[PDB]
Amino acid sequence: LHKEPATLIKAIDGDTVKLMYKGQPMTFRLLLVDTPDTKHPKKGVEKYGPEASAFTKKMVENAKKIEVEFDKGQRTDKYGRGLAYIYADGKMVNEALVRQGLAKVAYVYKPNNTHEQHLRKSEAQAKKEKLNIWS
Ligand SMILES: Cc1cn([C@H]2C[C@H](OP(=O)(O)O)[C@@H](COP(=O)(O)O)O2)c(=O)[nH]c1=O
Ligand SMILES: [Ca+2]
């Protein structure tokens, strides 16, 4: 896979961020995970929703460098969002959320599953530690 640079435009929520990519603003959705929704229609927030959102917003707004890494299949979803692994100063945001119990490994669609193992191990560790959502 290969990492390419991108620039933060804005964090939307725990798993969705807007970036300027190759000079065009696009919304990206983090591959392989799912954070709790905060703007569920009328609902206004699932437990850990707000928590997942600030974590991601904090990681990306404080980075010196952001990089996106596409997997091997489809690079956009049916909503037109780019599907990638996002790295903030070389730290993968997708894994950081899972490791904290603020996301679960979800939407696993072959062939975009290069880091599925890696993420599954971090989830196991967050479950074995009873963090956030596994609390
Ligand atoms: C991460 C991911 C989500 N999606 C789809 C599945 C879900 O569609 P539906 O809206 O049909 O449920 C939705 C999950 O997105 P959100 O978690 O942002 O809702 O996006 C993909 O199509 N491929 C992906 O890899
Ligand atoms: Ca979500």
- Ligand 1 touching residue 77 (CB < 6 A): yes
In whole angstroms, give the CA distance from residue 80 to residue 88. 23
Ligand 1, residue 112: give the atom nearest the CA. Answer: 25
Tokens 């899972």 locate to: 98
Q: What is the resolution of this structure in A?
A: 1.7
Method: X-ray
Atom of ligand 1 nearest to the CA of 32: 1
The C-alpha atoms of residue 47 and residue 132 are separated, in whole angstroms, by 9
Beta bridge partners of 82: 28, 76
**Cα separations (Å) of 57 from 14, 72, 83, 96?**
8, 27, 18, 12
Among 86, 89, 118, 123, which residue's Cα sits nearest to residue 104?
123
Token digits for 35? Answer: 């954070």
> Residue 74 CA: which ligand is closest?
1
Which atom of ligand 1 has the smallest separation from the CA of 34? 17
Ligand nearest to the CA of 103: 2
Token couple for 33: 């995970």
Per-position DSSP letters for 101-118, written without gaps between them: TSSEE----TTS-TTHHH
Class at the top of the CATH hierarchy for domain 1-135: mainly beta
